[PDB]
Amino acid sequence: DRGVNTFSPEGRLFQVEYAIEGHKLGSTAIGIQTSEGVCLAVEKRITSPLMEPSSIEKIVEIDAHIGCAMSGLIADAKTLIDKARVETQNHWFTYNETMTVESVTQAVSNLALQFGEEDADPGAMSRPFGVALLFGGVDEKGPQLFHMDPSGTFVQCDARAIGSASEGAQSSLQEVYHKSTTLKEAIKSSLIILKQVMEEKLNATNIELATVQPGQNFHMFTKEELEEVIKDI
Amino acid sequence: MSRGSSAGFDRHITIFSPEGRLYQVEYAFKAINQGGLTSVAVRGKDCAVIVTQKKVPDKLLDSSTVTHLFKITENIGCVMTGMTADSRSQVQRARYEAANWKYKYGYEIPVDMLCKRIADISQVYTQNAEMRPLGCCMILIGIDEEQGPQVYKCDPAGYYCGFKATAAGVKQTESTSFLEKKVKKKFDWTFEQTVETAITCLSTVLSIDFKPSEIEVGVVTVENPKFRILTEAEIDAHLVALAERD
Amino acid sequence: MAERGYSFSLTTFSPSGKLVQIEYALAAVAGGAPSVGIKAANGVVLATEKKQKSILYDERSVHKVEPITKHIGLVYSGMGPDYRVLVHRARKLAQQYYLVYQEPIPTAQLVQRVASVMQEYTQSGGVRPFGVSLLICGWNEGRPYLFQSDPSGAYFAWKATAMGKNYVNGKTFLEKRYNEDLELEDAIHTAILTLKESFEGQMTEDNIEVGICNEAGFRRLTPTEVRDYLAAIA
Amino acid sequence: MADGGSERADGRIVKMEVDYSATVDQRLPECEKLAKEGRLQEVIETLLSLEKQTRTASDMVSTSRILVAVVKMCYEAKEWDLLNENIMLLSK
Amino acid sequence: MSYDRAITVFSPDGHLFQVEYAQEAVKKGSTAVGVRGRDIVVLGVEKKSVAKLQDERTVRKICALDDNVCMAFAVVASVSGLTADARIVINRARVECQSHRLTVGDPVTVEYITRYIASLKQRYTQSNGRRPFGISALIVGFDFDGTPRLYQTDPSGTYHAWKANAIGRGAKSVREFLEKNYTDDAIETDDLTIKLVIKALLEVVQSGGKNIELAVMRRDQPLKILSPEEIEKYVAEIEKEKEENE
Amino acid sequence: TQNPMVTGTSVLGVKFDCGVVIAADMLGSYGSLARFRNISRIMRVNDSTMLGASGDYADFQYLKQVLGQMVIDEELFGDGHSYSPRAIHSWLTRAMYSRRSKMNPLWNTKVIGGYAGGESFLGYVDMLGVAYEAPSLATGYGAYLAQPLLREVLEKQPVLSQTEARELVERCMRVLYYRDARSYNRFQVATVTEKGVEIEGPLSAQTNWDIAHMIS
Amino acid sequence: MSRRYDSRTTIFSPEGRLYQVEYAMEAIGHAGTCLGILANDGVLLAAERRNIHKLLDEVFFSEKIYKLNEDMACSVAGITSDANVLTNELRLIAQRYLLQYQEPIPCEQLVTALCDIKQAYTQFGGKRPFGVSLLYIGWDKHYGFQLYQSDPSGNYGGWKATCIGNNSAAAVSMLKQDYKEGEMTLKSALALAVKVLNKTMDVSKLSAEKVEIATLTRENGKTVIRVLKQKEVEQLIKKHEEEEAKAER
Amino acid sequence: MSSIGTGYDLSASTFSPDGRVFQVEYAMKAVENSSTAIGIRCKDGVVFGVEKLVLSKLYEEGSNKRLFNVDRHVGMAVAGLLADARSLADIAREEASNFRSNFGYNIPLKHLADRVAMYVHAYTLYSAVRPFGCSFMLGSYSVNDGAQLYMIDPSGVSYGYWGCAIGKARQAAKTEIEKLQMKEMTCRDVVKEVAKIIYIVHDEVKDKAFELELSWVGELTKGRHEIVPKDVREEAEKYAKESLK
Amino acid sequence: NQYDNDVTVWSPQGRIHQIEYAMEAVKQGSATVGLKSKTHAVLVALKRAQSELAAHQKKILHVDNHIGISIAGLTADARLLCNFMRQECLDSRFVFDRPLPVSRLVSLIGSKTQIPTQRYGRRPYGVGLLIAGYDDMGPHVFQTCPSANYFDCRAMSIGARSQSARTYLERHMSEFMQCNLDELVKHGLRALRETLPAEQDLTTKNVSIGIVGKDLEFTIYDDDDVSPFLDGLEERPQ
């Protein structure tokens, strides 16, 4: 086909630069790291009032103590989560300790660029991934939020938002949040940017929030407990 | 000739033309013409002679693979004609197949069977464009055990049949007709004559001539069925005789 | 180390009951060597052009008339390398039959199995199907038989057919002409006359090559013999 | 083994046979003077063994020997056959 | 999985050419609506194309992936018939379903199938020879909790829980026509769900109940594919009803 | 003794390490079974120009250890930096291959003595076929273990600073017991000294026993 | 290069479907026709050979209809070349299932399994899908007498009378017109089979050499698959003369 | 030389209509731009000399190398694209090591020269790999067959050599080897003779200063490929400067 | 165009265009300085972050407690080579038990990164590694490119206008071997600023420090554990 080895004279891939535009049409995800937990926010994308928030999630379990909220292209997120889930469970038998939020993000980051037009294998691709994932979980070093992106780089962040506008959703988050603060203020800060960047506005079946504290397991929130977080936008 | 029309993706692929031509094979003939090597081969009843030119770029050489005479098995010997790079790869493949024959057959292989194994292998190359055919040409010489001396020629493709006398190289057709007159005139086959008739033909077609050191003659005599290179001395013996011969 | 290059289909269907690239292969056998085959009904005789038109030919075993086994012979028209593999494969197939049955491979069966590789090479990318067509003879069922296997892999059943230069014209002349109830000696005489009609130029005995299949078994006629037949008939 | 300069079947081509031919032409008149009176066949022979070489290149060198030789040979009625024969070999 | 070009190359749109092309390939597997009841979760398909020289089994868009999970397919387009390309997604889906029964022997979950399918489509992108998919499935089945499930998946790789969803001939359009028809009564009453499926199919197809074949699946019993003849009886009443909601 | 599954044996390999040098003494007599097939055989191999090997135990199992050794030095040269091995890495990499080889029915109690100084690191290593490998002052395994090693170790424990001369007279004495006790040889030895700069070894020369065991 | 071509074999086209799959159907149109008809006590296959030539020797009497098993039969509609490979795969599958099953192979089961291979190539492997639609006739207990139709597209169909090969639209209607659901018995059905073949050919005139007729009739304890000799078909060619009158009347 | 950048090199399995692939012709062109690496066969060994590029005074022996030991007795001097030369050294290192395991003797160079030349031709054949972009010499001293020097081009021709040089001026250096008789020399005199030729042949347009690094496989290194001994190096170094002047 | 995306089209200089692009990829990536002594090896790398409410990504990666690597370029391409370097070093440690030389390890990496340059239709990687190691000879800093070509340096700097950093390094080349662990870092800091504009100097949170030896085990200093190594720097030497 038309070049999939394509470098610019600056020295980056055109194809990677193309990958971001896909994320922008997709879903919106907020991850905030708190001292007192990690809270994860994600767009459910309502479009009927018949879609049940308790039965279906897009906050999903990597481990029983670790969560990941997805953004951008949905199909692409699933492939990264299934390899990451096994790596995590295999880690638990062997070490007998929960996997660092950083440890899982590094593994997925390998997949992002390895593409080429021909000589492709499962470890390689025909075009780079356009999803950014927010892996949030509590480990022995404390609550951490690590951020993985389409360029296949891992960075520690105490607040990252990626969605309809990646940089836009992160600039709203830069104004509100402060580094060290209470759980309710972090949960409030995640919802608040979310409705403004989106076309869609804040409801209790519009978005999905689940919170991981340290000393707790991953809990996906009940119908009532999802509605409690809505009162403070 | 034809360069073919595509209806598949024939242009860089070996697959058919309306001539029946295979693109990679026709390109294999142009590989012969690159090397500059031309060979004249003569069959007798005393011996089978292959005589071919030895390339000299400079006078600092060792002769062990500058040589285009190769031992493809101890009794039966051969030359590769054409581009020297393609020749070395083919010689290499053939020798592993030859050794395989040694494990299977257990002995010295007939000239008919030796050419047939190389032909089947080269069928793999010819059908592929995955790996381009090797654009060398092999003339096997040797004494088939009951029949006598034989000269067989395989093309890059692998087409082989018997001939009274054969030629390979930059131009097959021009060399053959010169050789055909030598064949009509059918000389008394003894050692001195069969070598000499081969040597005279290769020199007439070029019209450059040579000294004995400049060519390499390889014979398979009834005297010793071993494949033997004459060397500078023995070829010289024919050359001096040849001058006195009309 | 590894090879790729060409692995997508090279062959596209044409509305004619055949693909484009195979149709082109059948022209290749036409520009091939003249080979004629006639079933005499007390053996099959097959005759082929010995030459590759250099007219230095010195055959003692290097033939294009080859016994595969006890009662199967092959003569071809088209490509040399493509043919050598079919001969090597044929013996392995005949023997494959010889092990199970304790008789070698019937004409019909050998054709089914050779035909499957020739098609294989079509559908697959990075390969091309043979440029060879076979005149296959055999004695099975208590009757001589003769089959034609084309470079496509299709088979056409023939009591007499001609290949090589003017093949098309060759088939119509045979379709009308074909004979049966022929003595062995006559079989050769008819076969040579048909070869005269396909093949141009000189015929002597280092220009044409003849092989016969009968009850005693397939063998390949000595260059002296062919000459005596050739002279005999008008 | 041989290493450096000329090979062991290559690079003997430019010097060896060609040099010998150039030298014997020079030697020739002294040797020709004795030939007319008698014993020509040994005199032309030394040059002839070289001349047996069949290169294009050797012929050019060979133009030099004949010039002196023709004078005595024409003079006599028996010498003349011998130069002419050699020349027939070159063509044949 | 062998080719010699990439299967897709990325765009600055952020669409995959092959997944969108696949969506049309799955509307070849015509229109399918499925509604979730209290105890019977029902899906029905468009066209059986009856000519009474055929069998009814062979054209089905209803495929049994297990004996307690079943699905009907489509997505968007209007393009020509062909069961076959869709059928291929079923053949992967049926192994996927069956491997889970080996792992968890209770009636296998809908969620598992949908998730595996989204990831399955991304994976095919990566291999150069593998043709991607992009389909929607109306997954119907039961859990080990005995509660009804109707799930649906999309070419965008995303699966959602629903009380009624329709796919085919404009996915958003058949779905919206069901949104009107839906009331709170509908899902608990067993009788009411069946009528929803038949009104949606009756829109795009002429003379249904011969082109409406639907299956009910139950908590305790496996897949039952109803005869068409008992479905036609419903179509006649229900078509009276369909005009009323409009 | 102490040698499961042996045919051609090297009987005994002395190895005692002194300050920057090792002396190893090994007999030239190389019994193919009870019969001394070769009266002189050099059981000294050149790993490298900067390393040396001397080996005891079955001699066939030694040529195997030799081919494996040989490639490792090649690997280092192979880079283009043109490094000479370190005694610990080559001996150690092979100790692992001796853990794998146990499971199949061929046995190895193969014993080599590596002294090298290369790169900047000084090793004395001993590597076994059961894979007991260690740094040492003095070692010998197999048949060496049954009879000379304990007297060599007994002297080595209160005086850990024995020299190549005190060891020389002792090597000559112990091998006198080998000609008499072992059925794999009748004397004659090669004296090999490994250094950390060059591999040295004078050829096998005869030696002959002294009798005094028919007095009582 | 290879990166500058199209053939859209594994790659989907603007159509939403591959070129290679659609093209295969065109090749099938101008190649000899195969039909299978249902009878009350058997099933039969009738086919037009790919040989339009005037002289055949009959070396292989299966040049269109090959009997795989003693429980099954097939026809070829398309190119004989892709058939050759497929014929060899069929002799193995048909007998393997039987070793296990000990019951005459179900007509449906066979086709779906085969169709899976036809689709496998077009989707992946970078090979084109076989240019042959195979018409399977067989009998199993739980459907009864059967005819199933195979495509290069991986489409299967349960039929009672269908025809594929040349001028198929005409042919299926013509089989429907003469033969309704469950109407015609085995002998009278063999006649009907030749009658449609006479009308529909790539090249006219129906002869013994151009046709091969196969019967599945259940004999006393065994289901017998025979390909009829030229001699028997000839008696049907006169029967086919009688049949033309009979359809009309 | 023939090659055009459009057509008949848009796959590494495409054969050119001239009989010699464009890609192989391109591979030779890169050798022609690079610096001169020489290796001359002696009667008692082989002496290598390859110039080691110095772009900074931060560099040690490891930077910009062109002497490899394929075996530990066989050397490899390469010239041209360094990236492919070092990869072919790694596969070659493996190929030598496997040979030593099986065969068990100092390998005869004549066998290496055929197997490597065929391997270099294989990469021209195949699509997943492209031709090697260097010409290299293989040189050894052994007792099994003596001193041996072979050179393989990126075409995949092996020819035997008394003394070859590859560089920016391949023909001028080879005439200069011809003038001198190595027949008269022993391995000691050869080290002097290699050293001068490298300085004169090479034209600075990309260097800035180079260091000559030379290697012995000869008499004072005992049939294993070691870097030049100190005495030999100093004898060699003086003559090279003297020859300039 | 498409003749510059082909890995089978070359210049008349004999350079494949795809290898040429692949070297530049490093150069757009952030500057890293790697130095050695005769007891230690120091990796100083320049960081980046997405936001002020975030900590910077370690560009120093942890392999072993005797060898350590620092990346400049693409992280995802980096991670494949990283999975390769960890696999080989650990192998070496189990089987050989030698604390692996740097010099052997880089040459094998050179082989792998060379494979896509020969493959048709596959792009070369484009990340630069300065691999710091400590074996028994002493420390080495080897630099491996997106091509085979690898360097044995006393000090090297790669990235934007990296030639300028080498000049500072060359003036203090001898000193590096005498200096201490603490100083080797400070001389690294002073090189790293030359690459960047003279309008800007380093700060505490854009410096990552990776220290290597076997007199110490491997340490990564992040954004606030950087400070002790950082003190002692000169603002823009010209």
Swiss-Prot record, chain B:
Its main location: cytoplasm. InterPro entries: Ntn_hydrolases_N, Proteasome_alpha, Proteasome_alpha-type, Proteasome_asu_N, Proteasome_sua/b, Proteasome_subunit_alpha6. Keywords: Acetylation, Cytoplasm, Glycoprotein, Nucleus, Phosphoprotein, Proteasome. One of its GO terms (molecular function) is NF-kappaB binding. The modification Phosphotyrosine is found at Y159. The modification N6-acetyllysine is found at K102, K104. It comes from the Eukaryota. The modification Phosphoserine is found at S17, S63, S64. Signal peptide: none annotated. It is found in: Cytoplasm; Nucleus. One of its GO terms (cellular component) is proteasome core complex. Glycans are attached at S5. One of its GO terms (biological process) is positive regulation of canonical NF-kappaB signal transduction. The keyword Nucleus applies. Gene3D superfamilies: Glutamine Phosphoribosylpyrophosphate, subunit 1, domain 1. Belongs to the peptidase T1A family. Component of the 20S core proteasome complex involved in the proteolytic degradation of most intracellular proteins. This complex plays numerous essential roles within the cell by associating with different regulatory particles. Associated with two 19S regulatory particles, forms the 26S proteasome and thus participates in the ATP-dependent degradation of ubiquitinated proteins. This is Proteasome subunit alpha type-6. The gene is Psma6.
Swiss-Prot record, chain C:
The modification Phosphotyrosine is found at Y6, Y24, Y76, Y121. Belongs to the peptidase T1A family. It comes from Rattus norvegicus (Rat). It comes from the Eukaryota. Component of the 20S core proteasome complex involved in the proteolytic degradation of most intracellular proteins. This complex plays numerous essential roles within the cell by associating with different regulatory particles. Associated with two 19S regulatory particles, forms the 26S proteasome and thus participates in the ATP-dependent degradation of ubiquitinated proteins. SMART domains: Proteasome_A_N. The gene is Psma2. The keyword Kinase does not apply. GO terms for biological process: proteasome-mediated ubiquitin-dependent protein catabolic process; response to virus. It is found in: Cytoplasm; Nucleus. This is Proteasome subunit alpha type-2. The modification N-acetylalanine is found at A2. The modification N6-acetyllysine is found at K70, K171. The modification Phosphoserine is found at S7, S14, S16. Phosphorylated on tyrosine residues; which may be important for nuclear import. The 26S proteasome consists of a 20S proteasome core and two 19S regulatory subunits. The 20S proteasome core is a barrel-shaped complex made of 28 subunits that are arranged in four stacked rings. The two outer rings are each formed by seven alpha subunits, and the two inner rings are formed by seven beta subunits. The proteolytic activity is exerted by three beta-subunits PSMB5, PSMB6 and PSMB7. The lineage of its organism: Eukaryota, Metazoa, Chordata, Craniata, Vertebrata. Ubiquitous. Keywords: Acetylation, Cytoplasm, Nucleus, Phosphoprotein, Proteasome.
Swiss-Prot record, chain H:
Keywords: Acetylation, Cytoplasm, Nucleus, Phosphoprotein, Proteasome. Its main location: cytoplasm. The keyword Transcription regulation does not apply. The modification N6-acetyllysine is found at K57, K206, K230. GO terms for molecular function: ubiquitin protein ligase binding. Ubiquitous. The modification N-acetylserine is found at S2. The 26S proteasome consists of a 20S proteasome core and two 19S regulatory subunits. The 20S proteasome core is a barrel-shaped complex made of 28 subunits that are arranged in four stacked rings. The two outer rings are each formed by seven alpha subunits, and the two inner rings are formed by seven beta subunits. The proteolytic activity is exerted by three beta-subunits PSMB5, PSMB6 and PSMB7. Interacts with AURKB. Interacts with CDKN1A. Interacts with MDM2 and RB1. Interacts with the C-terminus of TBXA2R isoform 2. Interacts with DNAJB2. Belongs to the peptidase T1A family. This is Proteasome subunit alpha type-3. It comes from Rattus norvegicus (Rat). The gene is Psma3.
UniProtKB/Swiss-Prot annotation, chain I:
Its main location: cytoplasm. The modification Phosphoserine is found at S107, S174. One of its GO terms (biological process) is proteasome-mediated ubiquitin-dependent protein catabolic process. The keyword Phosphoprotein applies. Component of the 20S core proteasome complex involved in the proteolytic degradation of most intracellular proteins. This complex plays numerous essential roles within the cell by associating with different regulatory particles. Associated with two 19S regulatory particles, forms the 26S proteasome and thus participates in the ATP-dependent degradation of ubiquitinated proteins. This is Proteasome subunit alpha type-1. The gene is Psma1. The keyword Phosphoprotein applies. Proteolytically cleaved from a C-terminal extension in the course of the conversion of the proteasome from its latent form into its active form.
